Amino acid sequence: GADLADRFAELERRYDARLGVYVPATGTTAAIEYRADERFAFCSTFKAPLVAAVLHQNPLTHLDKLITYTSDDIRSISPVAQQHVQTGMTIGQLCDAAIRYSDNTAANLLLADLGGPGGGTAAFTGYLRSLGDTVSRLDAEEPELNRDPPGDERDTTTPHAIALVLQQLVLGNALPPDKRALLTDWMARNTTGAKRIRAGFPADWKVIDKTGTGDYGRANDIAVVWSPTGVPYVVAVMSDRAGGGYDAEPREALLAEAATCVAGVLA
Ligand code: NA
């Protein structure tokens, strides 16, 4: 008799990694949970709820507010923002870049919009508290949030927590449907996750996601997937390879394989 947890454990051993998985239960399906209550660094996965917080806090007209910044605001990696130092970027453009290009400057600017220059990470955490998440915490802005040592609770979430956050944001009622549609669209057009959860699900499944990558071999992806018949699931996959040191290689393929196991039981 097979056991999916044993297969996740095999993946761990094969990649010399720690893997966390959460797929919330539905009316038709059991939860999938593997190290789901263990802490993993957010890395860039926080950018999706960040955009939700900004959407939540403001009228949609706020998307047109122009944010200006200088070259001294640029934090690697900022594929969009570093090309717009002269023009600035609107809040909407920043949300786009933060999700679709994992743009770090965009994320820091959004944190500043949310909670001001000193308060953004605290404001973000407070948004998660408002969704019922009492475990997650954001402490640093980009790029330091990717660099906490293993064991350090700063800048961490759990697969269970982030999955339930994403569930509420995309499938639930955390956002009104207009704002929900914007978040969903940005995630749907993400340029970063083709080799993660997307790679484990057949082509006839829709996948929207937000990736995260950091030190200690951290590679995460949080997604909402729809079956070919329109049935949605939230899939959170987190990993690290802390045993390898701060410069351990993040392994996208581990997330792809984890997602394959998930798809195998959801299909
Ligand atoms: Na400027």
Active site residue 142: yes
φ and ψ of 90, to 5 deg = -70, 160
Residue whose pair of structure tokens reads 């293993």 in the numeric block = 150
40 within 8 A of 218, measured Cβ to Cβ? yes
Report CA(134)–ligand 1 centroid distance (Å): 37
| Catalytically annotated residue among 44, 78, 136, 239 | 44
Those residues whose beta carbon sits under 5 angstroms from the ion ligand 1 are: 68, 70, 85
Q: Which two tokens stand for residue 175?
A: 């956002």
Give 110 Cα–ligand 1 centroid separation in angstroms.
Answer: 16
Largest CA distance in the chain: 62
CA distance 95 to 210: 12
Alpha carbons within 13 A on the beta-carbon side of 209: 28
Asked whether residue 212 is marked as a ligand-binding residue, the answer is yes
What are the structural domains of the chain? 4-266 (3.40.710.10)
Is residue 200 part of an annotated ligand binding site?
A: no
Give the Cβ contact number of residue 68 at 10 Å. 12
The residue type at 200: G
Say if CB 1 and CB 221 are below 8 A apart. no
Name the token pair of 40. 């993993």
**How far does residue 3's CA lie from ligand 1's centre (Å)?**
55
Cα distance between residue 16 and residue 4, in whole Å? 18
- Phi and psi at 254, nearest 5°, equal -60, -40
Q: Can you say whether residue 238 is alpha, beta or left, with left for phi > 0 and alpha for psi between -120 and 50 degrees?
A: beta
The number of CA neighbours under 13 Å toward the Cβ of 95 is 29
Known active-site residue 78: no
In the numeric block, which tokens belong to residue 208?
């929207």
3-state secondary structure 100-159: HCCCHHHHHHHHHHHHHHHHHHHHHHHHHHHCCCCCCCCCCCCCHHHCCCCCCCCCEECH
State in Å: Cα 105 to ligand 1 middle: 13
- C-alpha 226: how far from chain center: 17
Alpha-carbon distance of 145 to 100, in angstroms, equals 19
| Bridge partners for 89 per DSSP | 67
To 5 degrees, how large is the angle CA 80–CA 256–CA 94? 20
Identify the CA nearest to 197 among candidates 52, 21, 25.
21
Distance CA 267, CA 263 (A): 6
Helix (H) or strand (E) holding 23: strand 18-23
Distance of alpha carbon 236 from alpha carbon 20, whole angstroms = 8
Ligand 1 centroid to Cα of residue 86, in Å, is 5
The catalytic residue among 142, 239, 252, 257 is 142
Q: Which helix (H) or strand (E) holds 236?
A: strand 232-240
